[PDB]
PDB file of C-alpha atoms in Angstrom:
ATOM      1  CA  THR A 399    -236.928 174.958  79.603  1.00 45.93           C
ATOM      2  CA  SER A 400    -234.262 174.053  76.348  1.00 50.42           C
ATOM      3  CA  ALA A 401    -230.872 175.045  76.598  1.00 49.12           C
ATOM      4  CA  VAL A 402    -231.387 177.152  73.900  1.00 50.06           C
ATOM      5  CA  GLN A 403    -234.248 179.298  75.356  1.00 45.85           C
ATOM      6  CA  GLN A 404    -232.399 178.909  79.319  1.00 47.21           C
ATOM      7  CA  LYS A 405    -229.574 181.370  76.978  1.00 48.32           C
ATOM      8  CA  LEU A 406    -232.316 183.214  75.017  1.00 47.48           C
ATOM      9  CA  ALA A 407    -234.386 184.302  78.758  1.00 43.03           C
ATOM     10  CA  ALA A 408    -230.614 185.118  80.280  1.00 45.46           C
ATOM     11  CA  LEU A 409    -230.589 187.891  77.194  1.00 44.60           C
ATOM     12  CA  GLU A 410    -233.624 188.962  77.229  1.00 44.46           C
ATOM     13  CA  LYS A 411    -232.890 189.541  81.603  1.00 48.01           C
ATOM     14  CA  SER A 412    -229.628 191.104  80.836  1.00 46.11           C
ATOM     15  CA  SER A 413    -231.116 193.386  78.595  1.00 48.16           C
ATOM     16  CA  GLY A 414    -234.371 195.061  80.349  1.00 51.06           C
ATOM     17  CA  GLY A 415    -236.587 194.248  77.306  1.00 49.17           C
ATOM     18  CA  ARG A 416    -238.882 192.308  75.740  1.00 49.20           C
ATOM     19  CA  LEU A 417    -237.361 189.032  73.092  1.00 48.32           C
ATOM     20  CA  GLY A 418    -239.460 187.028  70.682  1.00 50.77           C
ATOM     21  CA  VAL A 419    -237.419 184.527  68.807  1.00 48.79           C
ATOM     22  CA  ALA A 420    -238.820 182.135  66.286  1.00 45.19           C
ATOM     23  CA  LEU A 421    -236.857 179.585  64.322  1.00 43.08           C
ATOM     24  CA  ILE A 422    -237.597 177.320  61.760  1.00 40.33           C
ATOM     25  CA  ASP A 423    -234.758 174.636  60.885  1.00 42.22           C
ATOM     26  CA  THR A 424    -235.531 173.291  57.420  1.00 41.71           C
ATOM     27  CA  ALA A 425    -233.359 170.365  57.149  1.00 43.69           C
ATOM     28  CA  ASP A 426    -236.324 168.172  59.813  1.00 46.60           C
ATOM     29  CA  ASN A 427    -238.929 171.428  60.107  1.00 47.77           C
ATOM     30  CA  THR A 428    -237.843 171.394  63.996  1.00 50.88           C
ATOM     31  CA  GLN A 429    -238.246 174.666  65.662  1.00 50.01           C
ATOM     32  CA  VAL A 430    -237.284 177.184  68.018  1.00 46.59           C
ATOM     33  CA  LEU A 431    -239.373 179.078  69.427  1.00 45.67           C
ATOM     34  CA  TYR A 432    -239.029 182.294  72.240  1.00 45.82           C
ATOM     35  CA  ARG A 433    -241.843 184.549  72.651  1.00 48.13           C
ATOM     36  CA  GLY A 434    -242.822 182.832  69.735  1.00 43.83           C
ATOM     37  CA  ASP A 435    -246.459 183.748  69.940  1.00 47.31           C
ATOM     38  CA  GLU A 436    -246.583 186.967  71.479  1.00 46.16           C
ATOM     39  CA  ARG A 437    -247.115 189.961  69.360  1.00 45.29           C
ATOM     40  CA  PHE A 438    -244.536 191.921  69.119  1.00 43.66           C
ATOM     41  CA  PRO A 439    -244.370 195.543  67.144  1.00 41.84           C
ATOM     42  CA  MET A 440    -242.867 194.470  63.183  1.00 41.37           C
ATOM     43  CA  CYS A 441    -241.552 198.267  61.799  1.00 40.61           C
ATOM     44  CA  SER A 442    -239.863 198.160  59.033  1.00 38.22           C
ATOM     45  CA  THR A 443    -240.263 193.979  58.933  1.00 38.42           C
ATOM     46  CA  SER A 444    -243.185 194.357  57.595  1.00 38.07           C
ATOM     47  CA  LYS A 445    -242.050 196.231  53.917  1.00 40.09           C
ATOM     48  CA  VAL A 446    -241.106 192.291  53.550  1.00 37.63           C
ATOM     49  CA  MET A 447    -244.771 192.116  53.583  1.00 37.30           C
ATOM     50  CA  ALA A 448    -245.779 194.687  51.276  1.00 34.10           C
ATOM     51  CA  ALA A 449    -243.061 194.183  48.794  1.00 33.62           C
ATOM     52  CA  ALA A 450    -244.139 190.570  48.437  1.00 33.67           C
ATOM     53  CA  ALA A 451    -247.372 191.382  47.699  1.00 33.93           C
ATOM     54  CA  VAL A 452    -246.389 193.125  45.125  1.00 36.20           C
ATOM     55  CA  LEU A 453    -244.744 190.466  43.706  1.00 33.94           C
ATOM     56  CA  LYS A 454    -247.760 188.370  44.082  1.00 32.79           C
ATOM     57  CA  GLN A 455    -249.111 190.912  41.626  1.00 33.80           C
ATOM     58  CA  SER A 456    -246.392 191.078  38.939  1.00 31.76           C
ATOM     59  CA  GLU A 457    -247.371 187.489  38.533  1.00 31.33           C
ATOM     60  CA  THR A 458    -250.207 188.287  36.494  1.00 31.23           C
ATOM     61  CA  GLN A 459    -248.955 192.135  35.915  1.00 31.90           C
ATOM     62  CA  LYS A 460    -246.114 191.017  33.891  1.00 32.14           C
ATOM     63  CA  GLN A 461    -244.606 194.441  33.683  1.00 32.35           C
ATOM     64  CA  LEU A 462    -245.811 195.639  36.878  1.00 26.70           C
ATOM     65  CA  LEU A 463    -242.273 195.734  38.557  1.00 24.08           C
ATOM     66  CA  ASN A 464    -241.583 198.275  35.412  1.00 23.77           C
ATOM     67  CA  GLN A 465    -244.491 200.876  36.247  1.00 23.27           C
ATOM     68  CA  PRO A 466    -243.085 203.838  36.775  1.00 22.00           C
ATOM     69  CA  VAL A 467    -244.087 206.031  40.460  1.00 19.62           C
ATOM     70  CA  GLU A 468    -244.407 209.706  40.781  1.00 20.54           C
ATOM     71  CA  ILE A 469    -242.147 210.476  43.549  1.00 19.77           C
ATOM     72  CA  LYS A 470    -243.739 214.120  44.418  1.00 19.27           C
ATOM     73  CA  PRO A 471    -242.812 216.195  48.074  1.00 18.98           C
ATOM     74  CA  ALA A 472    -246.063 215.909  49.788  1.00 20.86           C
ATOM     75  CA  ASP A 473    -245.468 211.703  49.495  1.00 19.19           C
ATOM     76  CA  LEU A 474    -241.825 212.144  51.640  1.00 20.91           C
ATOM     77  CA  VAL A 475    -242.321 211.321  55.241  1.00 23.77           C
ATOM     78  CA  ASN A 476    -239.727 210.735  57.745  1.00 22.20           C
ATOM     79  CA  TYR A 477    -236.981 208.495  56.510  1.00 22.02           C
ATOM     80  CA  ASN A 478    -237.008 208.228  52.333  1.00 23.89           C
ATOM     81  CA  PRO A 479    -233.287 207.684  51.923  1.00 24.11           C
ATOM     82  CA  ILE A 480    -233.795 207.034  48.392  1.00 25.73           C
ATOM     83  CA  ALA A 481    -236.744 208.192  47.575  1.00 22.64           C
ATOM     84  CA  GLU A 482    -235.466 212.184  48.657  1.00 24.24           C
ATOM     85  CA  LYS A 483    -233.222 211.303  45.699  1.00 26.84           C
ATOM     86  CA  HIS A 484    -236.073 211.022  42.975  1.00 26.52           C
ATOM     87  CA  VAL A 485    -238.424 213.679  44.241  1.00 27.96           C
ATOM     88  CA  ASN A 486    -240.584 215.719  41.478  1.00 29.03           C
ATOM     89  CA  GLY A 487    -239.619 212.438  39.619  1.00 27.72           C
ATOM     90  CA  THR A 488    -239.555 208.734  39.054  1.00 27.19           C
ATOM     91  CA  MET A 489    -239.017 205.462  40.662  1.00 29.39           C
ATOM     92  CA  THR A 490    -240.167 202.077  39.015  1.00 27.39           C
ATOM     93  CA  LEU A 491    -242.329 199.401  41.204  1.00 28.73           C
ATOM     94  CA  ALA A 492    -238.597 197.328  41.387  1.00 25.55           C
ATOM     95  CA  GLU A 493    -236.913 200.591  43.009  1.00 26.65           C
ATOM     96  CA  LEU A 494    -239.629 201.248  44.968  1.00 28.19           C
ATOM     97  CA  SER A 495    -238.934 197.808  46.391  1.00 27.39           C
ATOM     98  CA  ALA A 496    -235.529 197.751  46.727  1.00 29.83           C
ATOM     99  CA  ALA A 497    -235.170 200.910  48.587  1.00 31.55           C
ATOM    100  CA  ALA A 498    -238.008 199.882  51.088  1.00 29.66           C
ATOM    101  CA  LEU A 499    -236.027 196.153  50.998  1.00 31.29           C
ATOM    102  CA  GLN A 500    -232.429 197.507  51.298  1.00 31.26           C
ATOM    103  CA  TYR A 501    -232.691 200.977  52.978  1.00 32.17           C
ATOM    104  CA  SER A 502    -236.039 201.061  54.183  1.00 33.14           C
ATOM    105  CA  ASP A 503    -236.739 203.956  52.771  1.00 35.73           C
ATOM    106  CA  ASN A 504    -240.514 204.805  54.110  1.00 31.84           C
ATOM    107  CA  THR A 505    -241.727 206.647  51.511  1.00 29.28           C
ATOM    108  CA  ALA A 506    -241.222 203.465  49.378  1.00 31.74           C
ATOM    109  CA  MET A 507    -243.391 201.710  51.890  1.00 36.21           C
ATOM    110  CA  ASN A 508    -245.748 203.979  51.416  1.00 35.70           C
ATOM    111  CA  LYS A 509    -245.755 203.424  47.784  1.00 35.50           C
ATOM    112  CA  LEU A 510    -246.222 199.454  47.843  1.00 37.47           C
ATOM    113  CA  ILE A 511    -249.173 200.251  50.194  1.00 35.37           C
ATOM    114  CA  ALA A 512    -250.742 202.688  47.540  1.00 35.19           C
ATOM    115  CA  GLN A 513    -250.070 199.362  44.800  1.00 33.80           C
ATOM    116  CA  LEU A 514    -251.428 197.249  46.647  1.00 32.57           C
ATOM    117  CA  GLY A 515    -254.784 199.733  47.822  1.00 33.84           C
ATOM    118  CA  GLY A 516    -254.218 200.459  51.313  1.00 34.72           C
ATOM    119  CA  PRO A 517    -252.384 198.442  54.536  1.00 31.45           C
ATOM    120  CA  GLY A 518    -255.721 195.944  53.944  1.00 33.60           C
ATOM    121  CA  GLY A 519    -254.024 195.031  50.984  1.00 32.55           C
ATOM    122  CA  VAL A 520    -250.860 193.710  52.767  1.00 30.81           C
ATOM    123  CA  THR A 521    -252.521 192.384  55.382  1.00 30.61           C
ATOM    124  CA  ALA A 522    -254.711 190.734  52.329  1.00 28.26           C
ATOM    125  CA  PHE A 523    -251.813 188.862  50.941  1.00 24.84           C
ATOM    126  CA  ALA A 524    -250.564 187.858  54.250  1.00 20.45           C
ATOM    127  CA  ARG A 525    -253.835 185.944  54.496  1.00 21.47           C
ATOM    128  CA  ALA A 526    -254.158 184.294  51.134  1.00 20.74           C
ATOM    129  CA  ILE A 527    -250.759 182.493  51.752  1.00 22.07           C
ATOM    130  CA  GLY A 528    -251.914 181.658  55.343  1.00 29.07           C
ATOM    131  CA  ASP A 529    -250.461 183.767  57.926  1.00 28.92           C
ATOM    132  CA  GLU A 530    -253.608 184.345  60.074  1.00 27.90           C
ATOM    133  CA  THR A 531    -251.335 186.500  62.137  1.00 25.99           C
ATOM    134  CA  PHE A 532    -249.620 189.797  60.666  1.00 30.35           C
ATOM    135  CA  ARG A 533    -251.979 192.573  60.091  1.00 32.59           C
ATOM    136  CA  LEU A 534    -250.796 195.811  59.033  1.00 34.50           C
ATOM    137  CA  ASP A 535    -253.325 198.976  60.028  1.00 35.47           C
ATOM    138  CA  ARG A 536    -251.517 201.673  58.982  1.00 39.55           C
ATOM    139  CA  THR A 537    -248.675 203.942  57.139  1.00 38.85           C
ATOM    140  CA  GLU A 538    -245.354 205.319  57.435  1.00 38.35           C
ATOM    141  CA  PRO A 539    -245.017 206.614  59.769  1.00 41.42           C
ATOM    142  CA  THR A 540    -247.419 206.045  62.073  1.00 42.71           C
ATOM    143  CA  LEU A 541    -247.019 202.149  61.835  1.00 40.49           C
ATOM    144  CA  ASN A 542    -244.102 202.516  63.970  1.00 40.62           C
ATOM    145  CA  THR A 543    -245.410 203.480  67.127  1.00 41.26           C
ATOM    146  CA  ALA A 544    -244.740 200.438  68.900  1.00 40.03           C
ATOM    147  CA  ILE A 545    -247.223 200.664  71.726  1.00 39.95           C
ATOM    148  CA  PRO A 546    -246.762 198.459  74.159  1.00 40.18           C
ATOM    149  CA  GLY A 547    -249.818 196.819  74.203  1.00 40.13           C
ATOM    150  CA  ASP A 548    -251.085 197.700  70.620  1.00 44.57           C
ATOM    151  CA  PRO A 549    -251.981 195.094  68.360  1.00 42.35           C
ATOM    152  CA  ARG A 550    -251.853 197.659  65.194  1.00 42.13           C
ATOM    153  CA  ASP A 551    -249.333 196.805  63.014  1.00 39.73           C
ATOM    154  CA  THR A 552    -248.012 193.789  65.359  1.00 41.24           C
ATOM    155  CA  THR A 553    -247.291 189.604  63.836  1.00 45.81           C
ATOM    156  CA  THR A 554    -245.708 187.472  66.036  1.00 49.47           C
ATOM    157  CA  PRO A 555    -242.233 184.940  65.814  1.00 48.05           C
ATOM    158  CA  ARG A 556    -243.677 182.169  64.927  1.00 48.98           C
ATOM    159  CA  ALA A 557    -246.159 183.361  62.390  1.00 46.16           C
ATOM    160  CA  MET A 558    -244.145 186.138  60.127  1.00 41.57           C
ATOM    161  CA  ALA A 559    -240.459 183.056  60.793  1.00 39.08           C
ATOM    162  CA  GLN A 560    -243.418 180.757  58.786  1.00 43.88           C
ATOM    163  CA  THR A 561    -244.391 183.132  56.321  1.00 46.97           C
ATOM    164  CA  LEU A 562    -240.632 184.497  55.265  1.00 47.01           C
ATOM    165  CA  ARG A 563    -240.145 180.631  54.937  1.00 46.21           C
ATOM    166  CA  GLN A 564    -242.588 180.819  52.510  1.00 48.06           C
ATOM    167  CA  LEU A 565    -241.476 183.666  50.571  1.00 46.56           C
ATOM    168  CA  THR A 566    -238.286 182.526  49.745  1.00 45.63           C
ATOM    169  CA  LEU A 567    -237.313 178.713  50.497  1.00 45.51           C
ATOM    170  CA  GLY A 568    -241.124 178.049  49.762  1.00 46.74           C
ATOM    171  CA  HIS A 569    -243.255 178.755  46.388  1.00 48.59           C
ATOM    172  CA  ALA A 570    -245.884 181.440  47.669  1.00 45.56           C
ATOM    173  CA  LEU A 571    -244.392 183.809  45.266  1.00 48.07           C
ATOM    174  CA  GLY A 572    -243.780 182.450  41.802  1.00 47.14           C
ATOM    175  CA  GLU A 573    -240.767 181.196  40.707  1.00 44.34           C
ATOM    176  CA  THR A 574    -238.867 184.323  38.962  1.00 42.68           C
ATOM    177  CA  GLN A 575    -240.274 186.527  41.886  1.00 41.76           C
ATOM    178  CA  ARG A 576    -239.803 184.765  44.946  1.00 43.43           C
ATOM    179  CA  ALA A 577    -235.686 184.706  43.071  1.00 46.05           C
ATOM    180  CA  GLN A 578    -236.013 188.875  43.217  1.00 47.77           C
ATOM    181  CA  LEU A 579    -237.688 188.556  47.736  1.00 47.28           C
ATOM    182  CA  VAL A 580    -234.206 186.778  47.807  1.00 45.74           C
ATOM    183  CA  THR A 581    -231.352 188.214  46.124  1.00 46.02           C
ATOM    184  CA  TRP A 582    -233.007 191.790  47.648  1.00 46.35           C
ATOM    185  CA  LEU A 583    -232.895 190.104  50.736  1.00 44.42           C
ATOM    186  CA  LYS A 584    -229.642 189.315  50.554  1.00 44.68           C
ATOM    187  CA  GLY A 585    -228.481 192.473  48.784  1.00 43.40           C
ATOM    188  CA  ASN A 586    -230.097 194.187  52.574  1.00 43.03           C
ATOM    189  CA  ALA A 587    -227.934 197.586  53.567  1.00 41.91           C
ATOM    190  CA  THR A 588    -229.119 197.752  57.530  1.00 37.18           C
ATOM    191  CA  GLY A 589    -228.467 194.293  58.741  1.00 36.01           C
ATOM    192  CA  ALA A 590    -225.093 194.190  59.201  1.00 38.48           C
ATOM    193  CA  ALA A 591    -224.969 195.081  62.909  1.00 35.15           C
ATOM    194  CA  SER A 592    -227.735 193.035  63.579  1.00 32.35           C
ATOM    195  CA  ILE A 593    -228.712 188.738  63.256  1.00 33.84           C
ATOM    196  CA  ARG A 594    -225.584 188.695  60.612  1.00 34.43           C
ATOM    197  CA  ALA A 595    -223.029 190.419  63.016  1.00 33.59           C
ATOM    198  CA  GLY A 596    -224.202 186.775  65.494  1.00 31.21           C
ATOM    199  CA  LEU A 597    -223.390 184.784  62.550  1.00 33.16           C
ATOM    200  CA  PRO A 598    -220.926 182.488  61.779  1.00 33.60           C
ATOM    201  CA  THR A 599    -219.500 185.106  58.866  1.00 34.33           C
ATOM    202  CA  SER A 600    -219.511 182.108  56.171  1.00 37.38           C
ATOM    203  CA  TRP A 601    -223.432 181.341  55.922  1.00 41.60           C
ATOM    204  CA  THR A 602    -225.111 183.621  53.829  1.00 41.99           C
ATOM    205  CA  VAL A 603    -228.379 185.472  54.979  1.00 40.97           C
ATOM    206  CA  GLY A 604    -230.862 187.964  53.214  1.00 39.47           C
ATOM    207  CA  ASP A 605    -232.396 189.937  56.293  1.00 37.20           C
ATOM    208  CA  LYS A 606    -234.574 193.185  56.879  1.00 35.17           C
ATOM    209  CA  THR A 607    -234.404 195.206  59.708  1.00 37.72           C
ATOM    210  CA  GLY A 608    -236.734 197.280  61.482  1.00 37.90           C
ATOM    211  CA  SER A 609    -236.462 199.432  64.142  1.00 37.54           C
ATOM    212  CA  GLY A 610    -239.445 202.413  66.244  1.00 37.23           C
ATOM    213  CA  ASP A 611    -239.963 203.817  69.109  1.00 39.38           C
ATOM    214  CA  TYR A 612    -240.105 202.231  72.982  1.00 41.87           C
ATOM    215  CA  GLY A 613    -236.690 200.621  71.631  1.00 40.42           C
ATOM    216  CA  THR A 614    -238.490 198.499  69.167  1.00 39.90           C
ATOM    217  CA  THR A 615    -235.476 196.543  67.182  1.00 41.31           C
ATOM    218  CA  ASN A 616    -236.033 193.763  65.019  1.00 43.19           C
ATOM    219  CA  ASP A 617    -234.533 191.744  62.042  1.00 41.80           C
ATOM    220  CA  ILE A 618    -236.276 188.393  60.260  1.00 39.12           C
ATOM    221  CA  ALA A 619    -233.523 186.282  58.250  1.00 40.04           C
ATOM    222  CA  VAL A 620    -233.234 183.530  56.118  1.00 37.14           C
ATOM    223  CA  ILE A 621    -230.041 181.549  56.168  1.00 35.22           C
ATOM    224  CA  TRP A 622    -228.118 179.325  54.247  1.00 36.84           C
ATOM    225  CA  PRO A 623    -225.617 177.906  55.954  1.00 38.22           C
ATOM    226  CA  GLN A 624    -222.196 175.364  54.321  1.00 39.92           C
ATOM    227  CA  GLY A 625    -223.611 172.138  53.136  1.00 40.42           C
ATOM    228  CA  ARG A 626    -226.730 172.064  55.787  1.00 37.18           C
ATOM    229  CA  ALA A 627    -230.490 172.899  54.617  1.00 38.13           C
ATOM    230  CA  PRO A 628    -231.522 176.070  55.531  1.00 35.92           C
ATOM    231  CA  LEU A 629    -232.758 178.316  58.668  1.00 33.48           C
ATOM    232  CA  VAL A 630    -235.200 180.586  58.396  1.00 33.29           C
ATOM    233  CA  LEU A 631    -234.691 183.024  61.928  1.00 31.88           C
ATOM    234  CA  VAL A 632    -236.955 185.789  63.667  1.00 32.27           C
ATOM    235  CA  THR A 633    -235.710 188.362  66.031  1.00 31.49           C
ATOM    236  CA  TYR A 634    -237.809 190.994  67.812  1.00 34.24           C
ATOM    237  CA  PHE A 635    -236.928 193.287  70.766  1.00 33.72           C
ATOM    238  CA  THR A 636    -238.742 196.003  72.427  1.00 31.41           C
ATOM    239  CA  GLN A 637    -238.569 197.716  75.324  1.00 32.64           C
ATOM    240  CA  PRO A 638    -240.285 199.409  77.904  1.00 31.07           C
ATOM    241  CA  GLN A 639    -239.476 202.791  77.791  1.00 29.54           C
ATOM    242  CA  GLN A 640    -240.675 205.115  75.128  1.00 26.22           C
ATOM    243  CA  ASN A 641    -237.347 206.607  73.990  1.00 26.34           C
ATOM    244  CA  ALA A 642    -235.441 203.704  74.873  1.00 27.76           C
ATOM    245  CA  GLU A 643    -232.318 203.591  72.510  1.00 26.92           C
ATOM    246  CA  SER A 644    -232.136 201.133  69.794  1.00 26.25           C
ATOM    247  CA  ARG A 645    -230.598 197.570  70.364  1.00 28.88           C
ATOM    248  CA  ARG A 646    -229.299 195.767  68.024  1.00 25.90           C
ATOM    249  CA  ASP A 647    -226.822 194.155  69.756  1.00 25.83           C
ATOM    250  CA  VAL A 648    -230.070 192.197  71.747  1.00 25.88           C
ATOM    251  CA  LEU A 649    -230.617 190.569  67.992  1.00 27.40           C
ATOM    252  CA  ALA A 650    -227.291 189.798  67.067  1.00 26.62           C
ATOM    253  CA  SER A 651    -227.183 187.707  70.153  1.00 23.74           C
ATOM    254  CA  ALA A 652    -230.273 186.187  70.205  1.00 22.65           C
ATOM    255  CA  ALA A 653    -228.655 184.866  66.189  1.00 21.70           C
ATOM    256  CA  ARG A 654    -225.838 183.692  67.598  1.00 23.88           C
ATOM    257  CA  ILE A 655    -227.117 181.113  70.734  1.00 22.94           C
ATOM    258  CA  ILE A 656    -229.297 180.019  68.074  1.00 22.55           C
ATOM    259  CA  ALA A 657    -226.458 179.459  66.094  1.00 27.52           C
ATOM    260  CA  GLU A 658    -224.677 177.987  69.153  1.00 25.71           C
ATOM    261  CA  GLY A 659    -228.072 175.822  69.174  1.00 28.82           C
ATOM    262  CA  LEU A 660    -228.323 173.653  66.818  1.00 28.02           C
TER     263      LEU A 660
END
């Protein structure tokens, strides 16, 4: 077991929970994994796949992101910071994608899922870009139940890091779409206490956090240090107690260990 792995194992032991980490260093395609093939509840990190799948649709439906979508009272779920502002009105698919990714709006996620024909349309996009692990089974809010051992709405750190790389640094999306995803991730508003808090303040980061029951606390990020090749980092964390508190500090600490580990 490697030096970075020993520090991550120690962080995990100190935390009381279960930590999953996958780093891809694109300089040499080397990887660091900690519980990299275990499944974790994705929670809102799955919004990246849904937004990316809509972006993929827009490569054929060129104006899709401008399409208005009605926000009705019946659409509101448990966390709708942006969609609440537009009930009885509309938002475009671009605005829904931004709200899902940058504010973790769950109504916005449901609109992306619906645009894709249900959760199976999100999974299908994952499969089409080579991700055989990701699975989205439910809509918001039930996809966040984060029940130990439940395979629904889970992925592995290894698979999510590989996918995130392909979507942002790779070319799984068309050129405008890849750039749009990168802009959205870089503009996330919910990540200050997670991976970003563990990294050198001079590194540029795009990320998407997740949170759920069992104190599930997640973040997936693309990292552009300077004058060194970009990195992809996934940090998933979940805990034994259904009502456990969030532990964004664990993600910051894992990122700090990975950053110190290069």
